[PDB]
C-alpha cells in the first residue's frame, strides 16, 4: 500500500527483490488487486481498450510517415517489378565505411532497409500515388489516436462513468455490432472502391476537392433505384488492360468474372467491391435478430433454454448457460480468442492462393514473411484460448447453477476424451515415424524402389472436383456435362478454370506422396497439442493426486515431495508444456510451405517431389543447401548486404541456448550461490560502505519457467525469421 505495488500490500511488505519482479507481472490482473469491485474492473477494461486503440493508430501513423519521408514510393509506382521498396533510413555511429557503401540500395543516397511488410502494394492498389496522400493519412491517424486518448480520459471520469448493468446488455451490443460495425464499414469500403480506387486503376484521379463533380458511372444512380442492376456490369476491363493507364479499360463497377488479372496476377477490383456490397447487405439484414426497447426480436435466454432434446441424451440441455457466459469474462475471452485464431489461420491460408494486391505475387519474400507471421500469431492466439478456458473453469464456474447441463456432462467424462486423444496421438506418431524411418533406411541401403509411397487420393479427388485435369477423374466441375457445370458455366467458371489450370500460380498446387507424410505429421502435432490443452483445462478443478486443486489457484509451484512427488501439477504448467508443441507444429508447417514454394519458384519441382519422402533429404536439400548464402554474410575477406541477417541468425541461436539454463538448473543451487556472494560482498573492504536496500534472492520456480519459455520463443522466432528472409532474398527466386 506504500511501496511500488500500490495495488497489493502483500507484495509490498516483503523486503526481497521479488517484490519488484512480481510487481510488473501482476499489473494487469484486475481481479487480484485488493478492494476490487465489478464496476472498477469493467471501467478499467474500457480504458485499456481505448489505450490499445490509440497505440494501434499511432503505430500505423508512424509507419505511414516514415514510408512517406524516407521511401521511394513515387519511383516505385512507375516500375513496380524493377524497384526495391524502402522502409526507413539507417543512422548508426558504429557503421564502418564498407557497411555504409554496401547498405545503400535502391535510389537512396544512404543506407536504407528494404521493406518486406508489403505495404507498398497494398497502398498502390487502393489508389495512393503521391507522398502528400501518405502525409495526410498520417495526420488523420494521429488525430484519431488523440481522439481515442481523449475518449478514454473522458470515460474514466465520474460523471460519464457507465454502470455494470450497461456492460451486461448482450442483445443491444450484438445488434449494434452486427449492423453498424460490420455492415456499415463494408458499405463505406464499397463506396471507396467504387469512387476512388477503381478510377485510379483506370488512370483517373479522384480526390477530396473534385469527388463531387465526377460520376463513378455514366448512368448514375438511376439503374440502382429503378431495378436494372445488370447495367452496372456491361463493359468490363479487357484482357489487354494495363494497370494505372487508360489503355483497354472499361466502365463496369460490379462484376463476377472470377480468376486473376493477367498483368498483375491479382483479383479484379470490381469483384472485391461486389463482394463487399453483398457482405454489407447480408450483415445489415442479419443485424436485426435480437430484441431491444421496440418490443420485437428474440431473447437469447429463451433461445438457449428451449433447446433440450427429448429422451434426456443431453442432460438438461442449455439451461443456465446464459448466466454462466454473461457473468464470466474469461468465457467470453476464450470464445473470442478461439474465433480470432481460426480467422487468422484462414487469412494466412487464403492470402497466398488468392492474392488481392497488385504485383505482390511476384514478390516472394513478402509472401513468405506474411504467411509465417500470420501462422505464428494464430498459433499463439489458439494457445491463449485454451489458457483462458482453464482460467474460467478455475475461477468462475458454479457447480450448483450448472447442474446436469452440457458443461456438467463435459466435466463428467474427461477420462474418455483424454484416452481417445492419447490413442489418436500415439497412432499417428507411431505410424508417421515408422514410415519415415523405413524410407530413410531404404534410401540409405541404396534401393529407392522399395520405398513405401502412398498417393493422397482423397485430396486429389477433391481437387479434380474443382476443375483440375492433372489426375484423370471427371467429377462435378471437371465433367463437361453436369448439373453444376451447366448451372455455373455462364458466370464464373470461364475465369476460375483458367486460373486454376495454370501452373505458374499457387492455386491448388499439384501434390504427391511427399505431402501425405507432412499432412499426417501436422495432424499429429494438432492432436497432441489439443490433448495437452484439453487435459490441462479439464483437470484444473481437481484430480486423484490432488482433489483440492481449485483452492490453491491457477498458478502455484507444486504440492511438495509427498505422495511420490508432485511437480508441474497446475494448469499453468499444462499451458507451459503445450507452448512447445505449438511452436513445433507451426515450425513444421512453415518448413513445408517454404520448401515447396522455393522449389516451385526456382524452376525445378522434382527436387521436392523426390527428396521429401525421407528426412535426410529434408536435412540436406533444405537447410544445409540453402544456408550457404546466409552464413557467408561476413567472411575474413569482406561482407555484403546480408551481413546483418547473418548476425541476427547467430544472435537467435545464443538466446535459444540461454533458455536451456533456466529450464534445467533449479533454485537451490543459485540460492546457495547468492548467499555466498552476499557474504563475499559484506566482508570486503572499501565496498561494504555501499549496501543494498532489497535483499537479493534467487528467482522463483514459475518465474524461472516463464523466463526460460520467453528465451526459447525469442530465439526460435528470430532464428527462423533470419534464415527465411536471408535465404529467400539472396536468390530472389
Amino acid at each position: 500500500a506504500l511501496r511500488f505495488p500500490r495495488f497489493s500490500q502483500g507484495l509490498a511488505q516483503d523486503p526481497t527483490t521479488r517484490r519488484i519482479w512480481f510487481g510488473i507481472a501482476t499489473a494487469h490482473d484486475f481481479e487480484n488487486h485488493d478492494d476490487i469491485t465489478e464496476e472498477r474492473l469493467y471501467q478499467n477494461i474500457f480504458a485499456s481498450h481505448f489505450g490499445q486503440l490509440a497505440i494501434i493508430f499511432l503505430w500505423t501513423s508512424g509507419n505511414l510517415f516514415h514510408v512517406a519521408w524516407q521511401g521511394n514510393f513515387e519511383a516505385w509506382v512507375q516500375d513496380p517489378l524493377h524497384v526495391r521498396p524502402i522502409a526507413h533510413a539507417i543512422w548508426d555511429p558504429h557503421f564502418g565505411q564498407p557497411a555504409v557503401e554496401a547498405f545503400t540500395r535502391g535510389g537512396a543516397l544512404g543506407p536504407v532497409n528494404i521493406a518486406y511488410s508489403g505495404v507498398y502494394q497494398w497502398w498502390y492498389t487502393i489508389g495512393l500515388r503521391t507522398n502528400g496522400d501518405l502525409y495526410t493519412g498520417a495526420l488523420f491517424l494521429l488525430f484519431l489516436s488523440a481522439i481515442s486518448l481523449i475518449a478514454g480520459w473522458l470515460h474514466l471520469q465520474p460523471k460519464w462513468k457507465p454502470s455494470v448493468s450497461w456492460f451486461k446488455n448482450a442483445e443491444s451490443r450484438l445488434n449494434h455490432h452486427l449492423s453498424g460495425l460490420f455492415g456499415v464499414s463494408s458499405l463505406a469500403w464499397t463506396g471507396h472502391l467504387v469512387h476512388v480506387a477503381i478510377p485510379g486503376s483506370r488512370g483517373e484521379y479522384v480526390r477530396w476537392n473534385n469527388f463531387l463533380g465526377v460520376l463513378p458511372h455514366p448512368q448514375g444512380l438511376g439503374p440502382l433505384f429503378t431495378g436494372q442492376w445488370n447495367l452496372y456490369a456491361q463493359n468490363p476491363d479487357s484482357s489487354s488492360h494495363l494497370f494505372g493507364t487508360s489503355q483497354g479499360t472499361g466502365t463496369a463497377i460490379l462484376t463476377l468474372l472470377g480468376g486473376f488479372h493477367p498483368q498483375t496476377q491479382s483479383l479484379w477490383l470490381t469483384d472485391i467491391a461486389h463482394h463487399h456490397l453483398a457482405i454489407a447487405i447480408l450483415f445489415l439484414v442479419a443485424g436485426h435478430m435480437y430484441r431491444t426497447n421496440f418490443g420485437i426480436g428474440h431473447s437469447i435466454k429463451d433461445l438457449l433454454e428451449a433447446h433440450i432434446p427429448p429422451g434426456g441424451r443431453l442432460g438438461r440441455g442449455h439451461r443456465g448457460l446464459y448466466d454462466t457466459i454473461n457473468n464470466s469474462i474469461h468465457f467470453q475471452l476464450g470464445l473470442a480468442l478461439a474465433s480470432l485464431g481460426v480467422i487468422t489461420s484462414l487469412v494466412a491460408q487464403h492470402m497466398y492462393s488468392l492474392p488481392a494486391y497488385a504485383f505482390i505475387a511476384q514478390d516472394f519474400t513478402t509472401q513468405a514473411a506474411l504467411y509465417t507471421h500470420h501462422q505464428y500469431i494464430a498459433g499463439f492466439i489458439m494457445t491463449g484460448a485454451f489458457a483462458h478456458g482453464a482460467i474460467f473453469f478455475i475461477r468462475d464456474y458454479n457447480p450448483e447453477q450448472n447442474e446436469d447441463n452440457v458443461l456438467a456432462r463435459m466435466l463428467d467424462h474427461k477420462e474418455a476424451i483424454i484416452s481417445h486423444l492419447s490413442w489418436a496421438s500415439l497412432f499417428l506418431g507411431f505410424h508417421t515415424l515408422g514410415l519415415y524411418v523405413h524410407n530413410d533406411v531404404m534410401l540409405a541401403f541404396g534401393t529407392p524402389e522399395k520405398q513405401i509411397l502412398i498417393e493422397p487420393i482423397f485430396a486429389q479427388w477433391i481437387q479434380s472436383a474443382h476443375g483440375k485435369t492433372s489426375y484423370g477423374f471427371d467429377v462435378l466441375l471437371s465433367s463437361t456435362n453436369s448439373p453444376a457445370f451447366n448451372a455455373g458455366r455462364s458466370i464464373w467458371l470461364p475465369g476460375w478454370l483458367n486460373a486454376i489450370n495454370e501452373n505458374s500460380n499457387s492455386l491448388f498446387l499439384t501434390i504427391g506422396p511427399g505431402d501425405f507424410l507432412v499432412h499426417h505429421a501436422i495432424a499429429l502435432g494438432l492432436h497432441t497439442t489439443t490433448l495437452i490443452l484439453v487435459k490441462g483445462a479439464l483437470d484444473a478443478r481437481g484430480s486423484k493426486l490432488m482433489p483440492d486443486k481449485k483452492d490453491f489457484g491457477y498458478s502455484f509451484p507444486c504440492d511438495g515431495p509427498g505422495r511420490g512427488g508432485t511437480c508441474d501439477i497446475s494448469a499453468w504448467d499444462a499451458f507451459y508444456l503445450a507452448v512447445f508443441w505449438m511452436l513445433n507444429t507451426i515450425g513444421w508447417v512453415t518448413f513445408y510451405w517454404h520448401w515447396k514454394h522455393i522449389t516451385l519458384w526456382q524452376g525445378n519441382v522434382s527436387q521436392f517431389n523426390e527428396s521429401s519422402t525421407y528426412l535426410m533429404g529434408w536435412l540436406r536439400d533444405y537447410l544445409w543447401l540453402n544456408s550457404s548464402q546466409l552464413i557467408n554474410g561476413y567472411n575474413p575477406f569482406g561482407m555484403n548486404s546480408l551481413s546483418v541477417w547473418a548476425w541476427m541468425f547467430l544472435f537467435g541461436h545464443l538466446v535459444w541456448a540461454t533458455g536451456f539454463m533456466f529450464l534445467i538448473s533449479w533454485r537451490g543451487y543459485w540460492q546457495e550461490l547468492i548467499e555466498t556472494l552476499a557474504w563475499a560482498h559484506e566482508r570486503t573492504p572499501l565496498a561494504n560502505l555501499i549496501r543494498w536496500r532489497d535483499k537479493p534472492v534467487a528467482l522463483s520456480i514459475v518465474q524461472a519457467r516463464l523466463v526460460g519459455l520467453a528465451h526459447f520463443s525469442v530465439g526460435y522466432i528470430f532464428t527462423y525469421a533470419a534464415f527465411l528472409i536471408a535465404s529467400t532474398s539472396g536468390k530472389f527466386g
Binding site: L2, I20, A89, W91, R693
Partner: peptide
C-alpha cells in the same frame, strides 16, 4: 535537415537514462 543526427542520440541514450533514474527513484521511495 540532419534530424537523425540529433534525434537518434536523444532516444538512444538520454531518454533511457532519465526513465531509469525516475523509475528507480519511484521504486525505492517509501
Amino acid at each position: 535537415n540532419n534530424l537523425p543526427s540529433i534525434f537518434v542520440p536523444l532516444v538512444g541514450l538520454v531518454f533511457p537514462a532519465i526513465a531509469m533514474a525516475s523509475l528507480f527513484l519511484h521504486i525505492q521511495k517509501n
